[PDB]
Design a protein around this ligand. Structure first.
Ligand SMILES: OCC1CCN(c2ncccc2Oc2ccc(Nc3nc4ccccc4[nH]3)cc2)CC1
Ligand SMILES: OCC1CCN(c2ncccc2Oc2ccc(Nc3nc4ccccc4[nH]3)cc2)CC1
Ligand SMILES: OCC1CCN(c2ncccc2Oc2ccc(Nc3nc4ccccc4[nH]3)cc2)CC1
Ligand SMILES: [Zn+2]
Ligand SMILES: [Zn+2]
Ligand SMILES: [Zn+2]
Ligand SMILES: [Zn+2]
Ligand SMILES: [Zn+2]
Ligand SMILES: [Zn+2]
Lengths: 318, 318, 318
């Protein structure tokens, strides 16, 4: 049978990639046509060779790719990068997650920014974009999930067709919650709740609502993982995100609205302090809380701390 | 019938767009996939819901889009922007124009820079491009019109198929003259003639040759309308046009010809004075004459004057 | 017959192009859709109107184009530029080369960088790219040749189908050797051998191994021909190559490897001295040796010398 022949197959990467893909700070490289293979490899190792039908998975992956846009940061490379961080979390906490969760979370990460235009929820609201009329909150994130379902609905694209309806409904809910959780506006309340539950000892991974919250934080951690890379990667990637943000600031000015310094290219000089503030207020607390809940995710926090030190070095003119 | 069902249809934009599209200084925004709908809306309001068969118009619009190139300024965004300025002129002088003219002029504006390479007529002549051998004068503009006719000749693309042959010939002549008029070399003589006829009182919109001249000036006014936007739009758009011009200057240098300061990136510092000179010699006289002939086009002149003041502020180092 | 109708055909370029295409320092221009015609013209003049079936050649050319990538330097424009330099060498040494060699070398030049990613052999090795596992030496160059053969194997793409098998095997060997010779690592040993054989008088174009070496040097000369253009062309093209090199340097830093100053954008200021060193160590000796072997290639050396002077002028701050 087809599933039998698939069980005999072994998917391998080049030697350096096989070794370094296990590291949290792995960078996927500039060879775009290797990314699909990298994702398949990760799915194989974290889920199993029989989790997805290979032909369907490849078809799905290429369609997801086609539905990411040629924008500076929120692109296909970001999608695979976020997926890899999830892989590393899964592999280092392999005891904790079900079959459905491993399937669902890697797919959720790959799909989490589908059809991103390089503009924030705030801008879409102020422009009065049709998406903002349909989705009052988490505008882009609800769209990302809608795009995911649409791709799954294409002929030969349902990678979950081997699942029972019950399991299918569960995995789609996992994916939905995970993608919505990438709305950074929702992160602040989520992390606060998680910190409180952790300190009191009420936090319980057997409780579905608590489990959803931890998955949420994992999604934030993966989404921001560019700050957990080695310095050259982190610093160069910052150029990409600011390219998007400054373009949005330009568009804000065209609406006759003064953008916040973050989106304003005239405030270029304040970038190092802006990043410092972001690490202090968002990135460090995220990875700190994550490391408390899932201790094997410690390398993410260490690398984030190292990058904070690098930004401090930039500020001092050193 | 199909035309009956179309009469029942109402095309609407988002609230902010419905309001602000009526303003001369409206900016069409960064969401490319909304531009076709914006054009259809404008056609509906200025011409009527029964002017074009919707299916044919949409097919036409997408083919026009496909025949604009990925250049910094003379692109699809410019085409829709010029079309919008015409819409605003038409709507504020709604009493003056025939059914054919409203149809023709919006289409002419949409098509007026079709297949632009980002190079001037001068460069094509000096390179010895095949187009310069075919069209001795108004080289690119004659090509733009040729492209328009070719698109109209495609199966299911004749948006004027409901017209009599007589009316079809008239609308094509309207379009031809309008597109040729966008050759800025022809603007100077046209505006001079118009000014003289206006001051003596010989100018008569019932005279076809006079009417052609006024339409010509309207085309210049729409073509240059980026100078009639709010300052942030006008200033940022200047970056796009200079990207094209400097690339042409580079190509001139490659032919062993010293380009004029306008096309020379080494003369970056002279941009503010260059713009001032352009507003004084071209833009202000254009909108001044247009406002004299068509008083409701006054906001274009006011906004142009405001931008002149902004360039003066740049020059002073303020 | 078809070949009879082809014999009656005359392919012509615009007047300026017909004249200036014969000059070594000709630049192919910014009009991409003219490059195929320029190549066909060159094939017609250097080989003959009956060398290739026109329909097949056009199909081949467009497929080659499609297999070059949108990178700053190693692109479709580079391919045609290298092909033109070969044309000029062939036309000025028209007595020396066989029918097969003229066919083969123009095609080899057009195909010599097929599917280039904008990264060096060194980077592919350090990344551990699958291509480096397949080709231990001349990694990209072996791939370029593999791509060439694959394109030739496509239905209706075998431009050599009129050749006997013996002649087909010969032309493919000519192409293979020529493309491999564009590996600059191999140039140093080749030029040294050629210089020694020239000075002793052992160099003999009737000896196949010697002939292969001279063709090799011709390939290096064509590959580097951007340094033999007029100053504005040479200087602007330098921007393109450094865009690629600096991107590679970025990627090196992402691997945790300090790149050499050549690939490091932080060493921007050292570009003029870097170019001077390159002209001294590589470019001048290449064209010097080539001019010794083939005296009519003298203009390449003169133009290279002129550009060396220009870089010296940059260094002095003049
Ligand atoms: O190192 C690359 C990563 C940096 C953080 N990344 C972000 N992810 C999600 C949202 C925003 C991200 O980047 C930021 C975060 C904070 C800022 N804050 C900020 N405030 C500023 C004030 C003045 C000037 C610049 C400023 N940047 C800017 C960009 C992803 C890529
Ligand atoms: O604000 C954006 C609009 C500016 C005017 N636009 C033009 N439209 C048609 C032709 C030329 C346009 O832009 C100009 C106009 C005049 C100049 N003149 C000029 N002379 C210069 C001398 C030295 C240095 C720069 C110079 N620019 C440059 C660009 C469209 C976009
Ligand atoms: O003028 C345009 C041509 C310049 C030479 N070109 C090259 N072709 C093949 C390989 C490398 C080419 O460009 C070079 C050659 C040498 C260098 N060397 C160099 N060393 C440097 C040290 C510090 C800073 C910059 C440096 N560049 C850089 C680029 C093609 C385009
Ligand atoms: Zn997102
Ligand atoms: Zn994201
Ligand atoms: Zn034009
Ligand atoms: Zn225009
Ligand atoms: Zn090469
Ligand atoms: Zn090359």
């Amino acid at each position: 049978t087809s599933e039998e022949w698939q069980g005999l197959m072994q998917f391998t990467l080049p030697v350096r990639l096989c070794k370094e893909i296990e590291l949290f700070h792995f960078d996927i490289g500039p060879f775009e046509n290797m990314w699909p293979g990298i994702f398949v490899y990760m799915v194989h190792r974290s889920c199993g060779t029989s989790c997805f039908e290979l032909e369907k998975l490849c078809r799905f992956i290429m369609s997801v790719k086609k539905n990411y846009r040629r924008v500076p940061y929120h692109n296909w490379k970001h999608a695979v990068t976020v997926a890899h961080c999830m892989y590393a979390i899964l592999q280092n906490n392999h005891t904790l997650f079900t079959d459905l969760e491993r399937k669902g979370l890697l797919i959720a990460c790959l799909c989490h920014d589908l059809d991103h235009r390089g503009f924030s929820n705030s801008y879409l609201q102020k422009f009065d974009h049709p998406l903002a009329a349909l989705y009052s909150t988490s505008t882009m994130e609800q769209h990302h999930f809608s795009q995911t379902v649409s791709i799954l609905q294409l002929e030969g694209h349902n990678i979950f067709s081997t699942l029972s309806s019950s399991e299918y409904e569960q995995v789609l809910e996992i994916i939905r919650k995970a993608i919505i959780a990438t709305d950074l506006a929702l992160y602040f309340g989520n992390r606060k709740q998680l910190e409180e539950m952790y300190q009191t000892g009420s936090l319980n991974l057997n409780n579905q609502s608590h489990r959803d919250r931890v998955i949420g934080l994992m999604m934030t951690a993966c989404d921001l993982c560019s700050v957990t890379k080695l310095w050259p990667v982190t610093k160069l990637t910052a150029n990409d995100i600011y390219a998007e943000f400054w373009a949005e600031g330009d568009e804000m000015k065209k609406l006759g609205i003064q953008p916040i310094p973050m989106m304003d290219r005239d405030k270029k000089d304040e970038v190092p302090q802006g990043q410092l503030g972001f690490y202090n207020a968002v990135a460090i607390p995220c990875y700190t809380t994550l490391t408390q809940i899932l201790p094997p995710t410690e390398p993410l926090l260490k690398a984030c701390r190292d990058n904070l030190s690098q930004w401090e070095k930039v500020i001092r003119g050193e």
